[PDB]
Write a protein that binds this ligand. Structure first.
Ligand code: CDL
Ligand code: PLX
Ligand code: PEE
Ligand code: NDP
Ligand code: SF4
Ligand code: SF4
Ligand code: SF4
Ligand code: ZN
Lengths: 29, 63, 96, 208, 379, 297, 176, 115, 144, 156, 56
């Protein structure tokens, strides 16, 4: 009767995860 | 290139064992007897070396 | 059911207590001796015997998977009662 | 088979068998046996005199070029006349393959140091000497690396007791740490876990 | 030429100095030798598992995974897919923890002490993940030679995802504090330069190889659990110095975030341990209901499973390099011999060559860039 | 012999020696050595302390787990002494003080406390009692210190007829007052001293505990060599590389050590007394930054 | 696939050279680092107010060991010695005999907490949930001896923590 | 037969030559060790200890065992000279804290079951 | 802005029962935050929550000034929390014991005790087994 | 009396000063040192109690043994302890330091650091959590609060 | 975070990024500490037939 229930990702999956380096350039010549 | 020396092997001075744990010990070389509680014989295949039993006493704490 | 040794120390549920001449009592001076006040034997003796109208019944200690392994107890002998070897609960057929 | 059983790889098995035959053919002076395990691991058993030649060939040959020494250790088997076996684990980055070379020695026969073939062997041979008492000839500086200074015996030998022979404590009378014979408050409990009713029929030995 | 002793992680280091130059560097080890390999011979395989937590005690589940893989190879069994995905996810988390510890400790020894706190907050969060999955923060013992001990709790994946979407900013802050700082570059650039051939001959592995331009990674060349089903890049150095290794470690942190994302989005259903009760213990309900399950539980927790006779060498891409186990079985339930291979051993052996012609302050930087933890070095 | 008190093991840290010793004054100079010797062979040691525990912390690693027990007490209450000596078969009295305080003069320390300890130990059924007095103790001594020592010795003998009396002479050691007092000065030719080593005295106490027939005996613990004070101080200053306590201690150091030929000594307990030359460097190395003194015998 | 971390060639035109000279002389990157530290200065710290606030814990977390009992009040332990056999540190010492009513019960159950590794193998080996590792972790001691637990101490720990222990077991037993 | 591979010495004469060289080196080193470690022993008793340690192995008739013993003693000397040891390691040769174990039958009978 | 933070500070002062209670909590817990009262403990502890604080600071306990036998106005410690509020306070569950109480047993301690190390009620270890070898008792009557 | 009240207040002041600034010197021998660092991490902030981070042995007040003590390492630890100023305390952290732990039956491991130095507080765990170590440190603070030196001096 | 707008802009300018987007302190976005019961399915060898151990 009872169906399987365990830890799973939500339908459609998780959102993207940022991993690339982000060191911005402020600005003064 | 080869010594060809005639002498029985003796490594007591190299093992680091204390003096009184070499001369006063008596090892027993035997095939262990089958545990009569069971019919299996797989524990009676090899030879075993064990040392003579020494004193065991009760710790005053924890017994 | 904690009893007191003639020396004065509480006798634990295992029945041990240091003798009068035992020097090891000195460890309890200026301190105390831990004794558990709930004796399991008495507590299980207080449990009433369950009445079941079946020749063989099973006991798992209650709670399902939170108890002990399920075992079956025969109740054919009328002189005594069936006792669980895990939990200590007693069972009996309705004689007369 | 079924999803609880590890799959086999016949291609790697054949490749390792072919390369073992190749190496054995090139060096018949030292190679005594070649084996390939069911999980695709290649072992080459050699005479002790061939440690430097075999290792140099495996490091420098164009078809082998095992440029990395993964690990070097010893195993103690008291029942053999040659008590210790020396195990070399090598890795080839060019061909993405691993090889194992085994030899043997006893308490009194030195094994040639392989520090000229692999610089990594320097500390491994020191550890082998410290733990098993195996002497390596022509080592740059052979000495204890793991045990305490003045420690007697080689602990990784099978007949060395688990807790050793001496124990340390601080003595107030001499105002220093002293060594005394070991005395356990609770003796280590020896457990007899080996059961009868032998488990793996494929490894059954002749009854002689 | 004066000789001085830097006495007591814990390390004794004997040097002879000619002014400011380091002429000879002789490290003395064994201050944390506990005889792990001899102690393993007196335990069953399950009993011997927790030693690997304490071997390299910054990367616990990686050592667990290496030992479990060795035992699985000797047993001729395989874990279920969900167990493998959990193993890889927690291995990447462990890599993040280890690289945080290494980079922040290396910065702290040089004199930069603030990123240590900044990233130890994240380390505490990952310790919370460890505690939730296993009940222990550090000495977890979660990865077993049949899979994993327990399934994940019902809300662990969402919290892991929430953690992973904010870690890149922490890496960015660390890079802002360290990457372009001129003092950090002066402390790290062209320090401890090692050639590719010398690294190969000295037994180096991991970052110590990749910083010299050697294109090698065990997760790519010899994948073991599901690493062929995930996509990531391998950072490669160009100068073989401390700065290149620092950049490589930061890039591995970013790639570990990438792999963690992939693992979270592709977690499969199913069981967590091999469905073979003669190796993996059964469930508690089965043990308390079925006769065979109770017998197998009793035998597995008293004697343990017997391993068919044989010897194997199993290595993984640990966060510090190639971590290997040479495991010998005699057919019983206790390992006959267990040799433990640690990359830190070879790295510390090469420390002497790496420090030739350098200042006294450069040896600290070389030690920090070698990522030396003495638990695995001494064993 | 009360089976729990039957000795077991090989005389080590976790062995059982059958000795349950209560060591009064174990927080002092001789007390640490006595407790160390008792605990290295695996005996149960009760350490009664009137001082702060922090000052007794150094005695903790001298025995295995559970073998050293600390209890508060004070010399003016017999109940504390009783509760400390209930379960012991050996009682050792090391309580002493070289000066008088506003709460304890020489009388309480050297007569009242030893007498109370001996009486309580006799009432509690303690098998052995070892009391420490001075070699130069006598009733007609000019100093109140030695008069109190003699009176306390007499009262201890009266209360505990089977007590072992030990009379050392100017114990020297690392924490010993005698070597240190002379070297911290940075008279003579008429007073003579015969100092004794601390380890010798501790081993003598242990052997007297072991000795069955040393029940009601009196011992005099003296060194091998007998020195004039001027030469001894010159030797002290030479060893320390140095250029060459109100009224009672100066009087005590100005009076010569007695000779007790009839009293048994360390040789009867199987101990060879160590000369001062072997341990003087050990004691006096810390006073720095070879021609041993002449002896009269 | 592989990536290059330090394979950038600086530009050699006059503008980029002037920019690098301005960075060298005016200390721009050091000001960036100072700004990062200043930004951290103005955010909320991560400190919790121990002991008034506590770190988050889970039901699975292993704490001080305790001996449990059945709702009737009898102890669950049946002296099978499986926990003692599985203990990787040999921290458990067990002695048993038939009880006065014939029950299979222990007379000695000792756990050396200075030998224990807190792995939790004993609680997963127990077939009757008798030995558990409860959630208490603040049980530091001033002496070595009080960390040598006997059966009375463990039974007292069980009676002391049974409510939380049972709640945690109810929360976690479906994962076991 | 009984042909074995040498370590350093083909026969007993050169093995004894190495033994004498090691003894000379230890004898020379004793005063420097006594002074440098601030030991409370004398030079005479240190040299007596060296002689006793050398004499414990006087029964060896195998040149390979002899030269392995020489190698071990030379490692010991290297540890002593380079001050890799501390004072405790040097003083461990004297067993000052160990109570003497009597040899006669009656004492062993009285103390316990150990022969 | 500044007026808002000053007003919240004055509200924190007023919400502790005035200046006296404000100073009392400031010197007892080094914190002056105000949260809703989750429940009351039988030994005197008070438990608060604030879901707008970050995780870890959203639950705290104000210890009682007098537990079993000691004055805990200054000397407080974590072992003073009973097991049910221990479970709630360590975030092992989202439900306080007030809403759902723990299961009642006859053997569960009615009075929680804190850590008693360095105290006459400390635990003193001992062997719980009986003598194994029984000695022979000689007769009291002389043989001859 | 006047003196009995003055010595009590002066003892209280000295004890408060000593326990309000404890400067620890930590032997990071093994993996208990990691939890020690996690106690210095922002979540717990051992500094905020007055317990500084990484004090020098010459100006340290408490020793924390965090990890396995081997026979090779014992003399160095004893020397470092001997170099500490007199008002010193020792905290044993972890099962290895407490009694040997998982290495207890080893040929090269001291079975508890209390064989080498006296120990004031034993912190159990393998490893103890940083919060458990904080509890142990606060217990040591209470123990320091409980002592009374000038009372003993006045009564002697 | 209970940070005023002026402090928000100041810290944003000092670090040079948007910090409220990615905060390092957990809030209500985390999972509940009380969770529903799981089910934990069984493995492939839980069949009632054609499941002889000699074949696996
Ligand atoms: C500066 C002058 C004092 C005011 C002040 O510091 O406000 C800073 C306050 C800082 O805000 P934040 O800490 O980033 O935001 C967190 C909430 O304010 C968090 O607010 P809260 O609910 O924690 O507020 C508690 C309240 C009460 O706090 C206290 O009673 C304990 C602190 C007393 C400090 C004195 O704080 C105060 O009323 C004291 C403010 C500073 C007084 C100095 O806002 C400003 O005034 C910015 C003004 C521009 C600064 C340049
Ligand atoms: C002008 C002349 C100067 C001469 C030299 C003076 C030196 C400076 C002294 C002046 C400063 C006073 C010290 C302040 C101490 C009070 C601290 C008090 O609040 O502590 C609490 C009160 O405890 C004690 O009751 C206080 C004892 C302080 C000393 C008592 C009187 C001392 C005055 C005597 C001064 C005479 C000097 C004589 C020589 C000149 C307990 O807190 P605690 O347990 O820690 O922390 C627990 C943590 N919690 C709170 C989060 C749970
Ligand atoms: C920013 C403001 C800071 C102000 C500047 C700093 C001010 C410093 C104030 C110092 C307060 C006075 C310190 C008193 C304690 C000194 C050390 C101590 O605790 O005493 C211990 C010591 C141990 O004695 P025993 O029991 O014999 O030990 C045997 C075991 N070996 O006891 C003593 O010596 C007590 C000495 C008598 C003190 C009587 C006077 C009372 C104090 C007055 C203040 C003293 C300084 C002026
Ligand atoms: N040169 C020598 O040292 C020789 C010593 N004498 C005698 O030998 C014995 C030991 O001498 P020694 O160890 O050097 O002296 P110490 O001063 O070093 O030790 C004296 C001991 O007695 C205790 N004690 C002193 N007074 C009292 C008291 N009123 N109440 C309770 N306890 C007290 C001390 O405790 P606390 O720390 O609290 O003060 C301390 O433990 C003493 O009886 C001494 O008189 C024999 C010949 C000389
Ligand atoms: S938790 Fe592990 S080490 Fe501790 S008693 Fe249980 S099985 Fe033994
Ligand atoms: S606690 Fe559990 S596993 Fe251990 S002996 Fe008792 S019933 Fe068996
Ligand atoms: S006590 Fe436990 S956690 Fe700490 S170092 Fe030892 S094994 Fe690791
Ligand atoms: Zn039942």
């Amino acid at each position: 009767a009872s169906k399987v229930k365990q830890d799973m990702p939500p339908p459609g999956g998780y959102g993207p995860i940022d991993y690339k380096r982000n060191l911005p350039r402020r600005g003064l010549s | 290139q080869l010594i060809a020396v005639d002498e029985k092997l003796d490594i007591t001075t190299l093992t680091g064992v204390p003096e009184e744990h070499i001369k006063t010990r008596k090892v027993r070389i035997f095939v262990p007897a089958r545990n009569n509680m069971q019919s299996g014989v797989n524990n009676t295949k090899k030879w075993k070396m064990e040392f003579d039993t020494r004193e065991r006493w009760e710790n005053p704490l924890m017994g | 059911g904690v009893r007191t040794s003639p020396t004065g120390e509480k006798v634990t549920h295992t029945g041990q207590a240091y003798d009068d001449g035992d020097y090891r009592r000195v460890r309890f001076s200026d301190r105390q001796k831990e004794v558990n006040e709930n004796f399991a034997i008495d507590l299980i003796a207080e449990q009433p015997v369950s009445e079941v109208g079946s020749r063989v019944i099973s006991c798992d200690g209650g709670g399902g998977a939170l108890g002990h392994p399920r075992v079956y107890i025969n109740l054919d002998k009328e002189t005594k009662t069936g006792t669980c070897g895990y939990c200590g609960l007693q069972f009996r057929q309705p004689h007369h | 088979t079924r999803p609880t059983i590890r799959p086999r790889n016949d291609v790697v098995h054949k490749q390792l068998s072919a390369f073992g035959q190749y190496v054995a053919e090139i060096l018949p002076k030292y190679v005594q046996q070649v084996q390939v395990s069911c999980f695709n691991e290649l072992e080459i058993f050699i005479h002790p005199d061939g440690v430097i030649p075999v290792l140099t060939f495996l490091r420098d040959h164009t078809n082998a070029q095992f440029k990395s020494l993964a690990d070097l250790t010893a195993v103690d088997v008291p029942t053999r006349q040659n008590r210790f076996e020396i195990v070399y684990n090598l890795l080839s980055l060019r061909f993405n393959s691993r090889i194992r070379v085994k030899t043997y020695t006893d308490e009194l026969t030195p094994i040639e140091s392989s520090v000229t073939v692999y610089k990594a062997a320097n500390w491994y041979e020191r550890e082998i000497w410290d733990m098993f008492g195996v002497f390596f000839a022509n080592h740059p500086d052979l000495r204890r690396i793991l045990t305490d200074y003045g420690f007697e015996g080689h602990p990784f030998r099978k007949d060395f007791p688990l807790s050793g022979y001496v124990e340390l404590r601080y003595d107030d009378e001499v105002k220093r740490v002293v060594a005394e014979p070991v005395e356990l408050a609770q003796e280590f409990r020896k457990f007899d876990l080996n059961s009868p009713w032998e488990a793996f029929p494929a490894y059954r030995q002749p009854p002689e | 030429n004066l000789t001085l002793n830097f006495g007591p992680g814990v390390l004794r280091l004997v040097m002879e100095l000619s002014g400011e130059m380091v002429r000879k560097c002789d490290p003395h080890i064994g201050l944390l030798h506990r005889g792990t390999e001899k102690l393993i011979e007196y335990k069953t395989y399950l009993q011997a598992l927790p030693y690997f937590d304490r071997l390299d005690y910054v990367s616990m589940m990686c050592n667990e995974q290496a030992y479990s893989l060795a035992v699985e190879k000797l047993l001729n069994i395989q874990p279920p897919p969900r167990a493998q995905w959990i193993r890889v996810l927690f291995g990447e988390i462990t890599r993040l923890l280890n690289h945080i510890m290494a980079v922040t400790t290396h910065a702290l020894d040089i004199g930069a002490m603030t990123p240590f706190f900044w990233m130890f907050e994240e380390r505490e969060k990952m310790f919370e993940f460890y505690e939730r999955v296993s009940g222990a923060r550090m000495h977890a013992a979660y990865i077993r030679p049949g899979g994993v001990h327990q399934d994940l709790p019902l809300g662990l994946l969402d919290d892991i995802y929430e953690f992973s979407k904010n870690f890149s900013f922490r890496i960015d802050e660390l890079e802002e504090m360290l990457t372009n700082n001129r003092i950090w570059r002066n402390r790290t650039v062209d320090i401890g330069v090692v050639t590719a051939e010398d690294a190969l001959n000295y037994g180096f592995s991991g970052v110590m190889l990749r910083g010299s331009g050697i294109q090698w990674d065990l997760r790519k060349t010899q994948p073991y659990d599901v690493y062929d089903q995930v996509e990531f890049d391998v950072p490669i150095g160009s100068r073989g110095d401390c700065y290149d290794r620092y950049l490589c470690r930061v890039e591995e942190m970013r790639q570990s975030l990438r792999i963690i994302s992939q693992c979270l989005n592709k977690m499969p259903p199913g069981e967590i341990k091999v469905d073979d009760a003669k190796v993996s213990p059964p469930k508690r309900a089965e043990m308390k209901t079925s006769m065979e399950s109770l017998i197998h539980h009793f035998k597995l927790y008293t004697e343990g499973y017997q391993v068919p006779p044989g010897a194997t060498y199993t290595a993984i891409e640990a966060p510090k390099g190639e971590f290997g186990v040479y495991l010998v079985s005699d057919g019983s339930s206790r390992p006959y011999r267990c040799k433990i291979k640690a990359p830190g051993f070879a790295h510390l052996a090469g420390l002497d060559k790496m420090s030739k012609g350098h200042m006294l302050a450069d040896v600290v930087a070389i030690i920090g860039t070698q990522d030396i933890v003495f638990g695995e070095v001494d064993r | 012999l009360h089976h729990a008190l039957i000795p077991h093991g090989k005389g080590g840290r976790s062995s059982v020696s059958g000795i349950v010793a209560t060591v009064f004054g174990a927080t002092g100079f001789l007390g640490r050595y006595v407790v160390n010797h008792l605990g290295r062979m695996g005996s149960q040691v009760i350490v009664p302390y009137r001082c702060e525990p922090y000052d007794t912390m150094h005695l903790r690693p001298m025995g295995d787990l559970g073998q050293i027990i600390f209890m508060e007490w004070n010399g003016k209450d017999k109940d504390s002494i009783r509760k400390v000596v209930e379960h012991s078969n050996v009682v050792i009295n090391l309580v002493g003080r070289e000066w008088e305080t506003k709460n304890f003069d020489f009388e309480d320390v050297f007569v009242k406390i030893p007498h109370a300890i001996a009486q309580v130990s006799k009432e509690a059924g303690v098998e052995k009692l070892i009391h420490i007095s001075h070699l130069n103790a006598d009733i007609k001594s000019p100093s109140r210190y030695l008069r109190s020592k003699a009176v306390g010795e007499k009262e201890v003998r009266a209360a505990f007829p089977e007590a072992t009396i030990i009379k050392p002479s100017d114990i020297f050691g690392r924490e010993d007052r005698f070597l240190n007092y002379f070297a911290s000065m940075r008279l003579g030719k008429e007073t003579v001293k015969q100092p004794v080593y601390i380890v010798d005295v501790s081993k003598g106490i242990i052997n007297a505990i072991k000795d069955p027939d040393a029940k009601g005996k009196t011992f005099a613990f003296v060194g091998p060599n007998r020195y004039l004070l001027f030469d001894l101080v010159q030797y002290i200053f030479a060893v320390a590389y140095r250029p060459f306590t109100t009224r009672d201690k100066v009087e005590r150091v100005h009076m010569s050590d007695m000779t007790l030929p009839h009293l048994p000594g360390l040789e009867d307990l199987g101990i060879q007394a160590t000369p001062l030359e072997l341990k003087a460097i050990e004691v006096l190395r810390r006073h720095r930054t070879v021609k041993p003194a002449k002896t009269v015998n | 696939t592989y990536k290059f971390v330090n394979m950038r060639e600086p530009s050699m035109d006059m503008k980029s050279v002037t920019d690098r000279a301005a960075q060298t002389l005016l200390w721009t990157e050091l000001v960036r680092g100072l700004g990062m530290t200043l930004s951290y200065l103005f955010r909320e710290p991560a400190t919790i107010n121990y002991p008034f606030e506590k770190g988050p814990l889970s039901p699975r977390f292993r704490g001080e060991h305790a001996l449990r009992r059945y709702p009737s009040g009898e102890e669950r332990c049946i002296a099978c010695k499986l926990c003692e056999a599985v203990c990787p540190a040999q921290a458990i010492t067990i002695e048993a005999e038939p009880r006065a009513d014939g029950s299979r019960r222990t007379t000695r159950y000792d756990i050396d907490m200075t030998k224990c590794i807190y792995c939790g193998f004993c609680q997963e080996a127990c077939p009757v949930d008798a030995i558990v590792e409860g959630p208490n972790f603040e049980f530091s001691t001033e002496t070595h001896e009080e960390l040598l637990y006997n059966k009375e101490k463990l039974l007292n720990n069980g009676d002391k923590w049974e409510a939380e222990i049972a709640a945690n077991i109810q929360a976690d037993y479906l994962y076991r | 037969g009984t042909s074995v591979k040498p370590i350093f010495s083909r026969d007993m004469n050169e093995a004894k030559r190495r033994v004498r060289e090691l003894y000379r080196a230890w004898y020379r080193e004793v005063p420097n060790t006594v002074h440098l470690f601030q030991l409370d022993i004398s030079v005479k008793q240190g040299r007596d200890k060296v002689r006793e340690m050398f004499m414990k192995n006087a029964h060896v008739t195998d040149p390979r065992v002899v030269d392995l013993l020489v190698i071990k003693g030379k490692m010991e000397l290297e540890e002593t000279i380079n001050v890799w040891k501390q004072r405790t390691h040097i003083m461990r040769f004297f067993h000052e804290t160990e109570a003497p174990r009597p040899t006669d039958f009656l004492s062993k009978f009285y103390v316990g079951h150990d022969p | 802005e500044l007026v808002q933070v000053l007003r919240r500070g004055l509200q924190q002062v007023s919400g502790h029962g005035g200046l006296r209670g404000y100073l009392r909590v400031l010197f007892r817990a080094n914190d002056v935050r105000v949260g809703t009262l989750v429940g009351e403990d039988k030994y005197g502890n008070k438990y608060y929550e604030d879901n707008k604080q970050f995780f870890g600071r959203h639950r705290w306990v104000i210890y009682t000034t007098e537990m079993n036998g000691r004055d805990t106005f200054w000397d407080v410690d974590g072992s003073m929390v009973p097991p049910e509020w221990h479970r709630w306070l360590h975030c092992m569950t989202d439900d306080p014991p007030t809403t759902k109480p723990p299961t009642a047993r006859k053997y569960i301690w009615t009075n929680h005790k804190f850590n008693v190390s360095g105290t006459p009620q400390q635990y003193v270890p001992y062997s719980t087994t009986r003598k194994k070898i029984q000695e022979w008792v000689p007769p009291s009557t002389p043989y001859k | 009396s006047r003196g009995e009240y003055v010595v009590a207040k002066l003892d209280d002041l000295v004890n408060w000063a000593r326990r309000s600034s404890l400067w620890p010197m930590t032997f990071g021998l093994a993996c208990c040192a990691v939890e020690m660092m996690h106690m210095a991490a922002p979540r717990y902030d051992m500094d905020r109690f007055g317990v500084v981070f990484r004090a020098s042995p010459r100006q340290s007040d408490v020793m924390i043994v965090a990890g396995t003590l081997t026979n090779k390492m014992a003399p160095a630890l004893r020397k470092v302890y001997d170099q500490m100023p007199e008002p010193r305390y020792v905290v044993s952290m972890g099962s290895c330091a407490n009694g040997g732990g998982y290495y207890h039956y080893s040929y090269s491991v001291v079975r508890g650091c209390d064989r080498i130095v006296p120990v004031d507080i034993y912190v159990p765990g393998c490893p103890p959590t940083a919060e458990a170590l904080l509890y142990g440190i606060l217990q040591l603070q209470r123990k320091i609060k409980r002592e009374k030196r000038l009372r003993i001096w006045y009564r002697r | 975070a209970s940070a005023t707008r002026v402090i928000q802009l100041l810290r944003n300018w000092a670090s040079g990024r948007d910090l409220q987007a990615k905060l390092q302190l957990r809030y209500q976005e985390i999972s509940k500490r009380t969770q529903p019961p799981p089910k934990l399915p069984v493995g492939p060898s839980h069949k009632l037939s054609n499941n002889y151990y000699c074949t696996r």
